[PDB]
Design a protein around this ligand. Structure first.
Ligand SMILES: Nc1ncnc2c1ncn2[C@@H]1O[C@H](CSCC[C@H](N)C(=O)O)[C@@H](O)[C@H]1O
Ligand SMILES: [Cl-]
Ligand SMILES: [Cl-]
Ligand SMILES: [Cl-]
Length: 255
């Protein structure tokens, strides 16, 4: 079995307390204690991760942006603040137990449309310039997550065949053999590479297939596996490192 599976088995074996501590050890963490009181305060902690990728040119949203699994709309409102973005369309399932789009008046809200009650697995693909997808339901089973990840990759493939040259797709479980194989074919066809965003907690192995990255998928996945494993069983927990939360400003925008 893979290093990923080993990390997963170990994680699952962790006690409640150990787990809580491990979760944010040496990670990058936003100060959300100000976001909780529009004043350009992002909806969620997902905003910071997209900002991390874009700041480093791993993805450059442009034109018509589609955001699959938009939830409250962190990614959708962020994309609306990008210079070359003209329209942002979000889709999310909503409903009991799930996140509803939160209406904001951060900068470019006038160009953001978010539709709830949409299961994107049954939604026919449409043309976009930039495809964002942040779907992935966790499970202690690597096997279960493998199958979910593959279902999302199959769904993402259909939108990516409509011509977006910019993309950012969450890979819930990048370390399983069948996912690794599918990523390689998808990389061959559409390019990009896998990146580990350091704001992600150590309790998950999520990586982002981003169009501005490149390189050997297996190596990148294995590197993350090892870093995550190296952070377990610490003598002293030093905690997370912080950065300022994103500014989304306010008001309508011209396009
Ligand atoms: N099949 C599906 N169709 C549409 N939305 C789904 C879905 N499966 C899961 N989701 C939704 O996808 C979301 C992913 S979390 C979205 C976070 C967002 N990027 C932000 O920054 O706010 C969850 O809110 C979940 O309800
Ligand atoms: Cl899922
Ligand atoms: Cl996370
Ligand atoms: Cl403007």
């Amino acid at each position: 079995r893979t290093l990923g599976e080993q990390w997963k088995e170990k994680l699952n074996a962790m006690g409640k307390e150990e787990f809580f501590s491990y979760r944010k050890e040496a990670i990058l963490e936003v100060d959300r204690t100000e976001a909780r009181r529009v004043g350009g305060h992002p909806v969620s902690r997902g905003t910071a991760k997209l900002r991390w990728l874009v700041e480093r040119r791993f993805v450059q949203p442009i034109g018509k942006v589609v955001d699959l699994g938009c939830g409250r709309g962190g990614w959708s409102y962020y994309a609306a603040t990008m210079k070359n973005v003209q329209e942002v369309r979000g889709y999310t399932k909503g409903g009991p137990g799930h996140e509803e789009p939160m209406l904001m008046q951060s900068y470019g809200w006038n160009i953001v449309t978010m539709k709830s009650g949409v299961d994107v697995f049954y939604k026919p693909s449409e043309i976009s310039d930039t495809l964002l997808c942040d779907i992935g339901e966790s499970s202690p089973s690597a096997e279960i997550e493998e199958q979910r990840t593959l279902r999302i990759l199959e769904m993402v493939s259909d939108w990516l065949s409509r011509g977006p040259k910019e993309f950012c797709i969450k890979i819930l479980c990048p370390y399983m053999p069948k996912v690794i194989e599918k990523l390689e074919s998808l990389q061959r066809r559409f390019g990009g590479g896998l990146v580990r965003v350091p704001l992600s907690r150590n309790s998950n192995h999520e990586m982002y297939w981003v169009s501005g990255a490149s390189g050997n998928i297996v190596h990148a996945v294995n590197m993350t596996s090892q870093v995550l494993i190296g952070r377990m069983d610490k003598k002293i927990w030093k905690g997370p490192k912080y950065e300022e939360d994103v500014n989304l400003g306010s008001g309508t925008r011209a396009v």
